[PDB]
Amino acid sequence: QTQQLHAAMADTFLEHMCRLDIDSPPITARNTGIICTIGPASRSVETLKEMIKSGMNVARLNFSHGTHEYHAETIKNVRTATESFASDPILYRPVAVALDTKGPEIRTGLIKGSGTAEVELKKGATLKITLDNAYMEKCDENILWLDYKNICKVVEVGSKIYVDDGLISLQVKQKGADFLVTEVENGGSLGSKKGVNLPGAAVDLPAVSEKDIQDLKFGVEQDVDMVFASFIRKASDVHEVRKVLGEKGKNIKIISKIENHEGVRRFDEILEASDGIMVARGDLGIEIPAEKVFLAQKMMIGRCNRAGKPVICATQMLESMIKKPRPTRAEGSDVANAVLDGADCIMLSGETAKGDYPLEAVRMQHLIAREAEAAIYHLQLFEELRRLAPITSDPTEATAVGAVEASFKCCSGAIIVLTKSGRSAHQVARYRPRAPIIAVTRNPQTARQAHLYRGIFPVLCKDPVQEAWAEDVDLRVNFAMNVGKARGFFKKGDVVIVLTGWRPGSGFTNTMRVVPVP
Amino acid sequence: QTQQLHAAMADTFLEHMCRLDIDSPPITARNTGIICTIGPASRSVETLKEMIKSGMNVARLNFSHGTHEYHAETIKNVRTATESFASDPILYRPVAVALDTKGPEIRTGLIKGSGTAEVELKKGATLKITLDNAYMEKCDENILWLDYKNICKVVEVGSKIYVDDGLISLQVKQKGADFLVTEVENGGSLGSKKGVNLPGAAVDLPAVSEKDIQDLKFGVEQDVDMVFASFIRKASDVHEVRKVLGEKGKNIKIISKIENHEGVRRFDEILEASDGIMVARGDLGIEIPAEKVFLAQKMMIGRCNRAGKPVICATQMLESMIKKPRPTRAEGSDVANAVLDGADCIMLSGETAKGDYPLEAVRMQHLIAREAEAAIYHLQLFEELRRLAPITSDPTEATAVGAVEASFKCCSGAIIVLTKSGRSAHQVARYRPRAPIIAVTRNPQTARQAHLYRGIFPVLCKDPVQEAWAEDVDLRVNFAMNVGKARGFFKKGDVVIVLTGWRPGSGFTNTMRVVPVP
Amino acid sequence: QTQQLHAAMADTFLEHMCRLDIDSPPITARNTGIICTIGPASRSVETLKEMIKSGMNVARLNFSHGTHEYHAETIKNVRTATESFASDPILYRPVAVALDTKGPEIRTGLIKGSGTAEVELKKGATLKITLDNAYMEKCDENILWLDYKNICKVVEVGSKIYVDDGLISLQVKQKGADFLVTEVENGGSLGSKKGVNLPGAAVDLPAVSEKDIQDLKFGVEQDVDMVFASFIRKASDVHEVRKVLGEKGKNIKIISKIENHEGVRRFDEILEASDGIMVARGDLGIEIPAEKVFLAQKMMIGRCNRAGKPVICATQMLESMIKKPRPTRAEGSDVANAVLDGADCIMLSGETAKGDYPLEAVRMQHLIAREAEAAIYHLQLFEELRRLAPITSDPTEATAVGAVEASFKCCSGAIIVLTKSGRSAHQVARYRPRAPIIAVTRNPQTARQAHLYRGIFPVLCKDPVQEAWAEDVDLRVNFAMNVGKARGFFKKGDVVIVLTGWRPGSGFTNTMRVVPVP
């Protein structure tokens, strides 16, 4: 068989594993979204044109570096590249723009005047941390200054302090008002203005820094689709971002980045306040012991799936491809297991931003995701998702499961959904069908934001709005039939599911039709 | 909560049993069809009017006794009573007519001329079986004659023979040409030309006798709805009954009655040729050990649910109500458990034909069915039915499940199906929703025939066909809405599932809708 | 194949039903205990000998009628009949003695003076309840007297009153101090000294009546094994029964008869307090709608399986066998379904007390049980029961689950349990093994009380205790081996599970051995 359908028919997960077949080829549609961060290696319009072809869905801009002019040109370049396919709206793939904030961080000062001076400190020694702004310009192996003036209020005696992405470890021996007496646990080459992390601490830094405010305005005026909000650690953080975007940015999706102990603890309140989640494994593994990261990933993916909210797996997924044309076996495993856990989207950061093989990384991401989507045990997944979802009076929700159930029964080529806000497509995607979801919309912003959801293959309709409702439906349905055929998702004669509303939107989606492809 | 909905959500069959609540009231909608046998007690037109008001769906006419004219007035009486209610199509309830044949039967010879004298037979004594036709009128307690010519070819030395519905047990000790020396294992009262039974033997009697031919032909010309074919043991037997019915009996449904060891062993091929099955417990209990009957009963119901074909639980259901005005506790258990096994229909042989209490027998039958229907573990039943059924390319099959799933999701008040031949409704029923299936049809036989399937509430539309397709759909859907409200299945504001086609044809049901009741 | 091993390997319950084979003979052992009501038809020793041969395990005594000398003679005969097999302790079947109390009851007064006097009663006519003792002997069609003087305190406006085993229905219109104005809802033949039932009411009669206290004391000195305590509606009732039995009868097991709405509604607290349960279907069907009994039955059986406490299914099991030598189809299904539900014990009330065919009923009870035991879906039953039972620290409990698991793995001939108190064998029995549990005990009361449990085939070891520990273990083990071989449970070479202690006398049945039959 194809697309692992022999494995799909097992009544046991162990047997499902036993039946996984390398000679069973997947179908051509790929459900998992691919976020690519844009930088010096992939900024040009020529490269981005080829990057959309290779399967990029969302462009990510990391605002830890680069000016507004630099980023605005990148967005102009993404748009030029994206709209270069617009000529044929049949083959047009919408591309989302994501703004990823710097967020609140903690830095150190310069060492003995200069900012490139390094001072080694031995393992087991003693070290003083100060808030005294006089040591801003000259740090030492005895005295270190940081720019976070509430450090003593949140950190007890016996607590650890990670310096320079977890290179140096430091136990606190004495508290006080404006100083900490510390003992070195790890040690190494200590440089100037390095990052500081406080594991297991309830850091009281503001949700959005001074720079964030500026960047969030910049995003609103640049018409971005989503904000990846750094260092989120409570519900009030998300609401702070919500309030700062205000009225003009109300339709922009907020994705909360969980990158610390507290974020994980208060996950349930963060998720209900957010539009979606990002498992920021890079910073997470600095904050919590690295060996616990997968536990957090599986928990966060589990709940986002249960809540029907988008989740993104991020960082180091194809890390070696920065320098080399092919990934390690660990990396291949990682991408496949993110998909198998239930990640809506997977990310590349540096692999495409700075690295030597940005295109090959996107291509590899595409190949694996595809293989992993067939390898999913849909039998267990659907039963579990449909029983953990409450009985509701919502007709759109009842129509949604009906479509997915039908989808499985007839091994459908696609689930076609007419939607303007995206909700109708999101409600299907929540139940995780094998069949791709071709989501037809006239709203450009909706089309771009749909990429956050697995299975949703968004298409933008250009055709003018017609007077008779039945004809406006058929126009959009037939357009979707023309997409599937062109992209080889299905051919004439194949069976598809079609979801429509009874009156012109939005939230009237109450009709499922099982139709052959014209 | 109502209709055992607290038990319905248990993740385990045991917990489902623990949650069964006598204080949880069922819905008014009853799903399991009731077949009544019409005889001396229920022949009256006054009686049939109130029996329709109780919950009779199928009228059984036993052609083991009574001439053609005797049963001819019966059909006319049922049709008179039914059409009395036809004054209001909203309240009108279709009543089907069945025909139970006599089939092949082995009888003994007369004793001492007149069949009134009694003969005694002792246990441990010997008795010879002879084929010589000179012993017809002279059957002793030392010699016995029976009209079955091939009794020596099928009976090995050591087999059992039963006389008069299992009263006298006989074990063979000698093989011969015309003689068989046989020892008595039970013995007792011995009447004239009594019923003979051959347990565990492939009896090669003709599938139908010339008496059965005239009954079947009489059925065709009286426009009956179904036939209960007696004594079926192989697939060819079912083909034989179909031959008699012919082209003019193409629509009449054949129900094969299983009542011997061979029929059970070769059940698969029988069900294949049959339109339905009847678990003939009365005659079966005589053939096979009576403690093994529940096994065959459950085996057959299981296989009929898996194949999606109607099955009837039969005989001695409410045995005590033949004299008493209330059933025993074992009888209540029996009705409930047959419904719990998955029987589409349950029936009363004698309770409605001869008994002192025929009217209330249906009421008790109707009261238990509703309660047992609620107590079904739908979560297990549905997931098992939908995975034993394969992946289909047929759009209507995919529509059926989606509707059933949607039905569960919004706890639908009903599944309305616009059907012509009934096939659309039949496809919903085989997935056993809890929500009643309202089948809207203009075909009067489709209406009557639909009572064979669980949960189908047939309604006959007397309105003329509208010039436009969409208008005729609405008229028929709105008709179902009026029916369900009047019968108290649901009210204004409730949510229902609607199944219609795309064009004024027949088979192609593809559109599922989730609509509120106007 | 044998004992539905083909069905037992089904990965689904629907397929398990489809695989039930009538040609698959059951194992020689029977696991369901059988209680028989000894009375006029079975009072004689010669009849009681053959009842133990047919397979009766417990002797019920109904103290609703008869005197102490009548019942002491009945126990005397039962005990001497049991001892007619005591000479060979390989074939010796322990037989338990059971006392079923009358309980508290509400009775009407004498009509028109005489005992047998008839008064007809119109539907809709008016009737008056009174507690005035002057009316005691002149109950008319206008005036009716009851001996329950707290009647008005437990009945509100609109409550029902049933008279004479639910023959007469009355609705309360006017309340008062000691009078109730009732409207007749049903009616018929009204006479003197007739039982009254209170549906949906908290009846505040004493837990044990003045007669019952003496009956229980009688039981203690007569040395009974159990008590079927009538009309238990709360936990406080079970304590009252325990209080009457006191120290001299602290070992006598209390089986609580649930027979009204309140008993069902407060079942949890009753089960906790009680040792066992009896689904008293007769009185339940009068108190609650007859169609609702199966709901209560399955509820209670499930809860008793979840709690691991004995449960008994009662009344009208084989009701037609009082006058006939064979059971009806509805009855054969009742027994089977009771076993499949998970009932520990089944009983016969009147079928063995007043009927003409008592032995045949017991043999039928025995035949249906063994068949229905093989048709259990053990894969589901074992994996639900083990999941619903909480994690323990008790080794005696942990060894049983493992021993049951071992039994399913090696398809064990039996599980042999050496137990002083019976507790060990009880702990095995709750996980419903397919293999017969041979409980070897030197304690005669342990031997008798063991019958309340499914699977446990008890054997009373009469050999003297040997000085060394190792000698004594094998002596009891080999004794059970001889029992199994002789009764035909297994042959030499077959695999058995053995459950014993390790240390001589530090308690704990903690050792599981897998051994061949020598």
Short mmCIF file of C-alpha atoms in Angstrom, two decimals, chain B residues 332-505:
data_model
loop_
_atom_site.label_atom_id
_atom_site.label_comp_id
_atom_site.label_asym_id
_atom_site.label_seq_id
_atom_site.Cartn_x
_atom_site.Cartn_y
_atom_site.Cartn_z
CA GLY B 332 -38.05 -8.32 31.41
CA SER B 333 -34.38 -9.32 31.40
CA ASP B 334 -34.84 -11.13 28.07
CA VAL B 335 -36.35 -8.17 26.19
CA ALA B 336 -33.73 -5.76 27.55
CA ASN B 337 -30.77 -8.03 26.73
CA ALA B 338 -31.89 -8.76 23.16
CA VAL B 339 -31.95 -4.99 22.60
CA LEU B 340 -28.53 -4.79 24.31
CA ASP B 341 -27.13 -7.53 22.01
CA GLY B 342 -28.22 -5.40 19.05
CA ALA B 343 -31.47 -6.90 17.77
CA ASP B 344 -33.29 -4.67 15.28
CA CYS B 345 -36.60 -6.34 16.13
CA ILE B 346 -38.29 -8.30 18.91
CA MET B 347 -41.53 -10.28 18.55
CA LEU B 348 -44.48 -11.92 20.34
CA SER B 349 -45.73 -15.36 19.22
CA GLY B 350 -49.03 -16.10 20.95
CA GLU B 351 -48.90 -13.24 23.44
CA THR B 352 -50.69 -11.22 20.75
CA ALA B 353 -52.19 -14.20 18.90
CA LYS B 354 -53.93 -16.24 21.65
CA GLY B 355 -53.19 -14.64 25.05
CA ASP B 356 -55.68 -13.03 27.43
CA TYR B 357 -53.53 -9.89 27.40
CA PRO B 358 -52.44 -8.88 23.89
CA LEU B 359 -52.81 -5.08 24.17
CA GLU B 360 -50.53 -4.52 27.17
CA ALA B 361 -47.94 -7.04 25.86
CA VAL B 362 -46.89 -4.50 23.23
CA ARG B 363 -46.86 -1.73 25.86
CA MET B 364 -44.45 -3.69 28.09
CA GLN B 365 -42.38 -4.53 24.99
CA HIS B 366 -42.37 -0.80 24.13
CA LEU B 367 -41.43 0.27 27.67
CA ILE B 368 -38.43 -2.07 28.02
CA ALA B 369 -37.03 -1.26 24.56
CA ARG B 370 -36.72 2.49 25.30
CA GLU B 371 -34.96 1.80 28.60
CA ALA B 372 -32.56 -0.75 27.10
CA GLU B 373 -31.78 1.52 24.13
CA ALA B 374 -30.53 4.22 26.51
CA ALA B 375 -28.41 1.64 28.37
CA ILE B 376 -26.43 0.69 25.24
CA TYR B 377 -22.71 1.55 25.46
CA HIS B 378 -22.59 3.66 22.29
CA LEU B 379 -18.96 4.75 22.70
CA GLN B 380 -17.78 1.15 22.33
CA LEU B 381 -20.45 0.06 19.86
CA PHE B 382 -19.85 2.92 17.41
CA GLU B 383 -16.02 2.73 17.40
CA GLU B 384 -16.20 -1.04 16.79
CA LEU B 385 -18.76 -0.82 13.97
CA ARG B 386 -16.90 1.96 12.17
CA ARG B 387 -13.55 0.11 12.21
CA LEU B 388 -14.82 -3.36 11.25
CA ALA B 389 -16.40 -1.63 8.24
CA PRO B 390 -13.77 -1.03 5.49
CA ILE B 391 -12.77 2.12 3.57
CA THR B 392 -15.41 2.75 0.90
CA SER B 393 -15.35 4.74 -2.35
CA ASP B 394 -19.13 5.20 -2.10
CA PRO B 395 -20.07 8.83 -1.21
CA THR B 396 -23.38 7.81 0.43
CA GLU B 397 -21.64 5.50 2.92
CA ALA B 398 -19.26 8.32 3.90
CA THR B 399 -22.26 10.65 4.32
CA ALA B 400 -23.98 8.13 6.61
CA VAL B 401 -21.14 7.88 9.19
CA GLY B 402 -20.48 11.63 9.19
CA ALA B 403 -24.15 12.18 10.00
CA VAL B 404 -23.99 9.57 12.81
CA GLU B 405 -20.82 11.15 14.21
CA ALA B 406 -22.37 14.65 14.01
CA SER B 407 -25.44 13.10 15.67
CA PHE B 408 -23.30 12.12 18.69
CA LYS B 409 -21.42 15.44 18.77
CA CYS B 410 -24.43 17.77 19.14
CA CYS B 411 -26.54 15.05 20.84
CA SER B 412 -28.98 15.49 17.94
CA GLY B 413 -32.75 15.23 18.50
CA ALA B 414 -33.04 13.24 15.26
CA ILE B 415 -31.42 12.30 11.95
CA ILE B 416 -33.84 13.28 9.16
CA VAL B 417 -33.24 11.36 5.93
CA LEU B 418 -35.02 12.03 2.64
CA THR B 419 -34.99 8.55 1.10
CA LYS B 420 -36.74 6.76 -1.79
CA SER B 421 -35.87 3.05 -1.54
CA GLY B 422 -34.85 3.29 2.12
CA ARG B 423 -31.17 2.55 1.39
CA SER B 424 -30.03 5.93 2.76
CA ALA B 425 -31.85 5.32 6.04
CA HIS B 426 -30.50 1.75 6.16
CA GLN B 427 -26.95 3.12 5.91
CA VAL B 428 -27.46 5.37 8.94
CA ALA B 429 -29.12 2.62 11.03
CA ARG B 430 -26.27 0.10 10.69
CA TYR B 431 -24.05 2.50 12.68
CA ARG B 432 -26.59 2.51 15.54
CA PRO B 433 -27.02 6.18 16.50
CA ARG B 434 -29.03 6.96 19.64
CA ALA B 435 -30.85 9.72 17.74
CA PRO B 436 -34.04 8.50 16.02
CA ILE B 437 -33.85 8.27 12.23
CA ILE B 438 -36.82 10.00 10.62
CA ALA B 439 -37.08 8.54 7.12
CA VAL B 440 -39.12 10.77 4.78
CA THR B 441 -40.42 8.81 1.78
CA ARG B 442 -43.23 8.93 -0.81
CA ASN B 443 -42.92 5.17 -1.38
CA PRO B 444 -45.54 3.40 0.82
CA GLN B 445 -43.66 0.06 0.78
CA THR B 446 -40.36 1.82 1.59
CA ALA B 447 -42.13 3.25 4.63
CA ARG B 448 -43.49 -0.13 5.80
CA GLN B 449 -40.30 -2.07 4.98
CA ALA B 450 -38.14 0.35 7.02
CA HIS B 451 -39.47 -1.06 10.32
CA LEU B 452 -37.01 -3.94 9.90
CA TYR B 453 -34.13 -1.63 10.84
CA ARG B 454 -33.41 -0.24 14.32
CA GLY B 455 -34.17 3.42 15.03
CA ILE B 456 -35.87 4.15 11.72
CA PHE B 457 -39.10 6.05 12.21
CA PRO B 458 -40.81 5.88 8.79
CA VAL B 459 -43.09 8.69 7.60
CA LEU B 460 -45.07 8.77 4.35
CA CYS B 461 -45.39 12.11 2.55
CA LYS B 462 -48.79 12.58 0.88
CA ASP B 463 -47.87 15.96 -0.64
CA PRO B 464 -47.45 16.26 -4.42
CA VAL B 465 -43.97 16.69 -5.95
CA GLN B 466 -42.96 20.34 -6.39
CA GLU B 467 -41.74 21.67 -9.76
CA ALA B 468 -38.34 22.69 -8.32
CA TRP B 469 -35.91 20.38 -6.49
CA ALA B 470 -34.98 22.73 -3.61
CA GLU B 471 -38.65 23.43 -2.80
CA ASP B 472 -39.57 19.72 -2.68
CA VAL B 473 -36.62 19.11 -0.35
CA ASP B 474 -37.75 21.82 2.09
CA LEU B 475 -41.38 20.64 1.99
CA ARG B 476 -40.21 17.12 2.89
CA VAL B 477 -37.70 18.30 5.53
CA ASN B 478 -40.28 20.63 7.11
CA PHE B 479 -42.67 17.65 7.12
CA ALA B 480 -40.17 15.68 9.25
CA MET B 481 -39.81 18.69 11.57
CA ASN B 482 -43.59 18.73 12.08
CA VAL B 483 -43.62 14.97 12.75
CA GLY B 484 -40.80 15.00 15.32
CA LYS B 485 -42.39 17.91 17.19
CA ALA B 486 -45.84 16.30 17.25
CA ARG B 487 -44.46 12.99 18.53
CA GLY B 488 -42.36 14.84 21.12
CA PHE B 489 -38.97 13.73 19.77
CA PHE B 490 -37.87 17.39 19.87
CA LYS B 491 -39.03 21.02 20.01
CA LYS B 492 -38.28 24.45 18.48
CA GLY B 493 -34.64 25.42 19.00
CA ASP B 494 -33.29 21.86 19.11
CA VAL B 495 -30.61 20.73 16.65
CA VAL B 496 -31.17 18.02 14.01
CA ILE B 497 -29.16 16.27 11.28
CA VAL B 498 -30.60 16.49 7.75
CA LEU B 499 -29.66 14.08 4.93
CA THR B 500 -30.67 14.98 1.37
CA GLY B 501 -29.45 14.49 -2.20
CA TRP B 502 -28.19 17.02 -4.75
CA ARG B 503 -30.66 16.22 -7.55
CA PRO B 504 -34.25 14.73 -7.84
CA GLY B 505 -32.84 11.19 -8.27
#
